[model samples]
Target: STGSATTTPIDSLDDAYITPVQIGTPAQTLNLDFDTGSSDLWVFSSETTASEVDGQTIYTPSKSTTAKLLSGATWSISYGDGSSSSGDVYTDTVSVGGLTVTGQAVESAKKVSSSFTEDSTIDGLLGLAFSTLNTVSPTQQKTFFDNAKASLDSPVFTADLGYHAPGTYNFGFIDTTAYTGSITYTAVSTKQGFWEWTSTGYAVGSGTFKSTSIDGIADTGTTLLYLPATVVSAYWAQVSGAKSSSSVGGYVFPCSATLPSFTFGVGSARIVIPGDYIDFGPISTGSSSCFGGIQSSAGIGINIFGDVALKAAFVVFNGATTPTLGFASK
Candidate 1:
């Protein structure tokens, strides 16, 4: 049997897509970010330090008759954005959409960094990276998708992340109508616990597409597109008022600038980001300056095709065999 789920975007955060997932018997639901970059199914729970627990709905495993502790098991995780969480582990029945799995490892957060405590809305994270990357110590944990894939007719899921809009996360099957044009599939090199693939090249504005190879990960958890410093500079060069600002951080430009479209080559297919979308938003209300959605991934060493880039395409994250990433116009 197949399953599917709808993702709701937070109006204020504008960074992640939260999916409703149920864990344990009698179903305790939580809003979780479906993060493709990390591998761990964690939640804000009663175990969390009371001070770190702000406005989030905490998960109480003791309330669930089916919840069982994975003796001595523990987990800790930190994100690129500095958000972090660590906790003890529990085995419970976890369900996504109609898919269910028994004995699934659920990491209950005992301590969360201020980044997570401040944001309140994101209760936890559902890592879709790979089971090998799971953080459960002593023994690694399996993600809901990993555990459910065996029961699914097709070992695949589609990430249709929309820009400031609702998108659907379809499991076990692909909905042809969700995308337009032919789905272009590319080989994914998963040595890094990420959906890493190389783009044939890129171009700024209406210029000819260069044949420079860019190796990067398709990360749903990352909010903005991150490219090499040189690539970012070239794109901003086309904009009259764009500048790299130490004060503003990254690159910034006049909100009214007529920015050029950035295009990336995926084999023969091209993934383009519209000029307007490049202007992430104003630095502040009533301000003329705006931050760039595309920035340099210099320190990170690898580029990231985050939500901005993924939203422009209908992405197929195939887990069937030798994982491949398929992209098509949305």
Candidate 2:
């Protein structure tokens, strides 16, 4: 038995999934964005500037008897999307689903960028990335999953991100019923502190697979799938009225454009992203201009298999020696 704990995700702003987490004594519940791109369990708290608090629920350390201030310790982090938060540290009990971890380093934000403050409903971020990516200064901290893995039957977690609907994040076990077909396993490189992998190639609708290799990360926090500029251009070429639009950002196509299916190769698995999913709705109200769900990674160096891509498959983030990714169609 893997001692699994299942967490149901809330479809947040159509950008990321938010899950409930209990932190500190008496169980202060918060809706946190579970991110695989970075590591840090930071939250809005009493330390946060009054003006920045907005409508977010803050963690009051003094309310919890078990909270211990890590004197002189601090943490700061910035995401590729430009969101950032930084503050002091406190050691406390953090619980997710049915699993509880004591002495987990909780970063309490004193200041947050507008991107974070504007999202009043997002209380914090729960980083599921490797502990090596933890941002605490003076000494790094361990992620909730890493600290709880020892007690798990298997060092694994599975993500089932759904399209415009709720999904589940299963800890320590894989739910066979959630996916169809056998899971295809592929080797991953965590040297960059990310669930990074290389794809053999990809193809447009009904096209033959190319040998071009792509290095990317399995990031659940991001909203859309990001690929190389050249690859993105090739796919957009298949659709009429699709072109890079600086005003709209990334690539935009007419709302009625017929989108073609996109396929990504992982080991021997050909995970197909439906044409409808590629068209990420309209960019603005009362307009037919739509933004593409797949865009160019460009300056970001690494391609991101964000919600747009992950939602297409059931992903197993196996933490066994030399982490690997197992993919299966839903």
Candidate 3:
């Protein structure tokens, strides 16, 4: 069986993408972030603290006859940005697109960080990473994708993210029309619970392609593209008035400056990210300098090819016996 879902941008910056998911008996439809960076199908529910809940929709297990508590089990997840959530576990009927999985682990949050509470559009997060990364205790639970894989037409899922536009997530089958040219395949390492892979190298604008091997994860949940300091510095150098400022976090540049395209390699193919995509957004309401979409991964230890990079191409997360990643230009 296979299914598909649309990924809608929740904010103008395209900070997060939300997809509708059906959970429980009568179908508690909630908009959740399909996060590939982490594992744990967690949600904001009746179990969460009252004060912690904001305008977001909540999943109340008591209202669903199919919901059953996973006795003594619990789950917790934290992000690179410091936002986190944790709570009790429950098994319920969950559906996405046209695919339904019974007894799917549904983690009900007891506490959540301020960032999550403020983002009303995102009711919870549906993890797409390998099940080994699941945060559940006692018996680590399987992710929705993991449970759905057995019955899938093909053990693979594709991600197509657009800038300020609607994208999609297709399970079990590859949508050939969504991408252009033949797909270039790369090996993925799930040892750390991420769709991690290595790129051949990168080039700044029209500069020569570097043969450096850059290792990173393809994360749909993260907002920006993070790379090594050398690569980031090289990209920023082309733009006038670009500098690394402590006050604004990472690199910032003149808002009106013409940005250059950036390219990264996936096997023999080179994917180019348009210059407009790099001009992330202004730092403040009237700030003259804008924060760059590409930043240094120094602080984070690991490089992350987030939405900024993912939006430029169609990505395939192959979950078959030998997991692999596929990239194609759109």
Candidate 4:
């Protein structure tokens, strides 16, 4: 590991939430969910209903001597599907990857929706994306990076999203050997979410789409790639035979098929997107919904080239070098 930032604040929600958290001593352990999609972490309390929750880690304020509430402030967030959850704010000493972050802000769910409230296997999500999107931050409260930037072992952090086979994503350190020597750079555009990027174009097979550029941030937390209608339709035309049904979204193909591979030019580096990725799954309704490559990401302003595209390469997020993005090997 390189000697970069000494702080251990999370890099992305996917990296933060996937790693397990230590709540108690070695005798008793609790693993929590860390997600980069959102910016919040909350474990269930002892007050949870066991019948509703399965194997989730429950927090006992009285059990541990390191717990505090967030001044009675209420918090809630809704997802694109309209599902939402609300809870009371709290503070605790959260630990990740053998690193301890004291006085970390945490949210405790008081009233979650029927879907979220019933899950007991997962304690709750630990938001590891950027701090600017944090729900608990005061107007001036420092983002996770601001408070812990120096703790990072490397100025650059990389994520390897393993989605199909026990998928994994790592953070805080970058293994240079895993990446190609060339790293790309793109100046961060002035956006409200601190997310903005310029794309060269999209490539399916050897033919590239030049009608318009797919510009957006490369996020590891998001599951699917968002594309423009023209690019999506053109890409889909090549693999329409693969779709088992029109109902299923995206390309649904066998992992063993001669799937077409797409690449995205992010500045100097080109990130490869595998064919199996676009094919999410066999159509749920149809016999062979190939769900060919690309989907309608219309109305969604931010064209998020999510984890599927990200996992194919080694990505370096360089906040130290004036908000730059770089790439290496996968």
Question: Candidate 4 lDDT, tens digit per residue, 1-330?
Answer: 222211121332222224456653331245554444455666676654545456666776556667776675666677543556666665666555555555666566665566555544456666545566666534212333334456766555555555353333344676556566676777765354444577777788777645345677666545567777776666666653544334443445543456677778776556777776665544454544434435556776667766666667666666574666665545
Task: Superpose all Cα atoms of candidate 3 onto the true structure and report the RMSD in Å to 1 decimal.
Answer: 0.8
**What clash count goes with each model?**
0, 0, 0, 37
TM-score of 2: 0.95
* lDDT agreement of model 2 with the native: 0.87
**Candidate 2 local lDDT, residue 232:** 94
Cα lDDT of model 1 by residue, 179-217, tens digit: 888899999998888989998999998998999889999
Compare the candidates by lDDT and give the number of the best one: 3
Best model per TM-score: 3
lDDT of each: 0.88, 0.87, 0.94, 0.56
Q: What C-alpha lDDT, on a 0 to 100 scale, does residue 280 get in candidate 3?
A: 71
Residue runs of model 4 more than 4 Å from their true location after superposition: 1-17, 24-34, 47-52, 114-122, 137-146, 166-171, 209-212, 242-258, 290-293
- How well does model 3 score by local distance difference test? 0.94
Q: Residue 204 in candidate 4 has what lDDT?
A: 82
- Give, for candidate 1, the lowest lDDT window spanning 10 residues: 8-17
Query: Whole-model lDDT, candidate 4?
Result: 0.56
lDDT of 2 at 21: 85
User: Residue 222 error for model 2, in Å?
Assistant: 1.0
In model 2, the clashing pairs are none
Report the C-alpha lDDT of model 2 over 262-329, residue by residue, as the tens digit. Answer: 99998877899998878777888778998898999999888999988888999999989779999899
In model 4, state the lDDT of residue 328: 52
- Estimate the TM-score of every prediction: 0.97, 0.95, 0.99, 0.79
